[PDB]
Amino acid sequence: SAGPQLNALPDHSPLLQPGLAALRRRAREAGVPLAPLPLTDSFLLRFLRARDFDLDLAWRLLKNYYKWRAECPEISADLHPRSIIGLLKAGYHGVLRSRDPTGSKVLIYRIAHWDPKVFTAYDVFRVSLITSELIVQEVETQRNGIKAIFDLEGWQFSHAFQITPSVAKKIAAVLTDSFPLKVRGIHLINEPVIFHAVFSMIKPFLTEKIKERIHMHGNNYKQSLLQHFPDILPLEYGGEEFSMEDICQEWTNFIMKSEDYLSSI
Template sequence: MSLPFRFTPKSIIADGRTTQSHIDTIKNWLNATTLPQLQEEFITLFLISCNNDIDATKGTIEGYFKIKKGAPQIFDNCNLDSEELKNIQKVIGIYVAPTRMDNNTAVICAKMMDTNYRHCDIVSAMKLAVMHAHFMQIDDPPNELVIIFDMEGIGFMHLTCLRMSSVISYLKYVQDGVPLKIRDVHILNCNYVFDRAIDLFKMFIKSELMKIVRSYPPGMNMETFRKEWVPSSCLPKEYGGDLPEFDSLISVTAKQLKTMQPFFDEEEKLRNGHNSLFIK
């Protein structure tokens, strides 16, 4: 079983981002575990995300499979033709910037397109976010990731959409299982809802993550934001950026995501077709 990545480990090694020795070390370790045997491309993702730290890479791989196995409602059935994913794409807009920041840093941005809390399915929203994370890595794995979330239109009733167990699983994945190094998380148009959500889940958020979360009030100076944090080349017109309007970027990303369906299908088969009882 082979996942359809569109890059080669040789290209990553040639760029000096990892080494064949590191890849072989993880392959040998996997052979001694009950984890799925991963192709070199997949191993490369984990190594890059962990700065080639072998112990951290092993822990992240274990976390990836353990957490995904424990929360199938988020990580399984990633079918873009399903009704729940069709619906959530009308509610939440996500784009992956076609350009990258310094150090090959990818930028992903999300905001509510439909602010009616009754239409917000948080589990499907998290599933869609996971799918976009995979999408960013299939062609050229980024060294780092910057996340932007615009809270405009989110109110108190959106808190009733949260599902405690699923949000906890998602937070665990972001912190301990995702093969991506998160550089910064920017929360735009922040309000009291963000503070209440942090209060609800703060015991599940590591200090390392909280240190890179930055919140901004409505009416913030976007010029300062563009100079200090995310350049115009990665932002839509609405934020004073050089990219097209948000709606257009969402549409382009959604079409590109559709090409990922074979990957999502094979990735689930890799996980669920493997009788792994490694969970500690």
């Protein structure tokens, strides 16, 4: 249980240096790229915290992160938000202002606001990557992980058509062992009945990384979603203070302010 205690330290604690040294030596040895991603303490700590300072797992995650980036150029080859600013303006995606009861950052995606005649699955994936790279900078998010809510109202066949076996593989990767964020929960709301039926059959065979972390609320989601996310949801989902539009505009603004950092990858 040393791991979670190391996670709880600030980045400048000398106690994190043994793990950082051990990981940086493994990275260097396997010939990790020099390409505009510096192996700073703060960067490397993301991987250590994601795997509670288990060095072998932090290293495997780091390698898989590099592998995933190399394997998905149409997502990862340019992180400047200029390519997806329409999706953001359309209201596809926002991050809640407040954390949930266990301190997780909460992400919301709205499928009705993705026009598949305009944006590909890879554009939409680029949105998640951008957000991920931003939120991972907060040490509390590294410690407490994330939850994502997918509002599937208006899910159409044109959306489903974009999820090929290749896209499915890339989705599983980022949820499991290819990005330095702990996915503590995946919530679907307003999703078609077919999701439940499939899930009831495949659930027992899923990786334990996600198996017990998937919650499908269906159309009657208000009460159940509220139990997981009290006092932090937008008006549209049963919250009290701000609209989803406010959240989307606030997150969009933050992305644009970070445009040079995003490019610098």
